Design a protein that fits this description.
Layout (H helix, E strand, L loop, with lengths): L8 E9 L1 H8 L3 H9 L3 E7 L2 E7 L4 E6 L5 E4 L5 E9 L2 E8 L2 E10 L2 E8 L2 E9 L1
Antiparallel strand pairs: 1-2, 1-10, 2-3, 3-4, 5-6, 6-7, 7-8, 8-9, 9-10
The structure holds the ligand CC1(C)COC2(CC[C@@H](CC(=O)O)[C@H](Cc3ccccc3)C2)OC1.
The site of the ligand CC1(C)COC2(CC[C@@H](CC(=O)O)[C@H](Cc3ccccc3)C2)OC1 has 18 residues, from helix 1 and strand 9.
Keywords: Acetylation, Cytoplasm, Lipid-binding, Nucleus, Phosphoprotein, Transport
Function: Lipid transport protein in adipocytes. Binds both long chain fatty acids and retinoic acid. Delivers long-chain fatty acids and retinoic acid to their cognate receptors in the nucleus.
Pfam families: Lipocalin
Length: 134
């Protein structure tokens, strides 16, 4: 057993708050915000050795990242930003930092009760998204 066991599996979005405002703060344009805000993604997390894979599947986009904790990678986000990302585990929370154009956003994923809670922060704006097991 290991590092991310309680994250592994298939998760479905059940609530969102403040996500349009988070996307505005990131710089996402109107049409992408509307369609992405409507999305109801499933998040699929798996681990093979030291490699963690996180997929987000929705009617808007299907994305996939694979990474090693603490080891930076280049990522194309669903809104087509080219970012440099690093994901670490900090006290049981997966912390995903994206850097681009002198900007930074952090996405935190944690287990709370039977939920996987996702907190997205861009300057002073936070969005909270809650997932349950599918
Ligand atoms: C456009 C974005 C700025 C691109 O990056 C994210 C970062 C936070 C993610 C939060 C989560 O996993 O629920 C989110 C997932 C998602 C939402 C809607 C459609 C497809 C994927 C993707 O926010 C919207």
């Amino acid at each position: 057993s290991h590092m991310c066991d309680a994250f592994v599996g298939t998760w479905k979005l059940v609530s969102s708050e403040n996500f349009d405002d988070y996307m505005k703060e990131v710089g996402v344009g109107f049409a992408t915000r509307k369609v992405a805000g409507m999305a109801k993604p499933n998040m699929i997390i798996s681990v093979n050795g030291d490699v963690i894979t996180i997929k987000s599947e929705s009617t808007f986009k299907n994305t996939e990242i694979s990474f090693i904790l603490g080891q930076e990678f280049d990522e194309v986000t669903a809104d087509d930003r080219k970012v440099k990302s690093t994901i670490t585990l900090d006290g049981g929370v997966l912390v995903h930092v994206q850097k681009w154009d002198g900007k930074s956003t952090t996405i935190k994923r944690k287990r709370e009760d039977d939920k996987l809670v996702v907190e997205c922060v861009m300057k002073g704006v936070t969005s909270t998204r809650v997932y349950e097991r599918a």
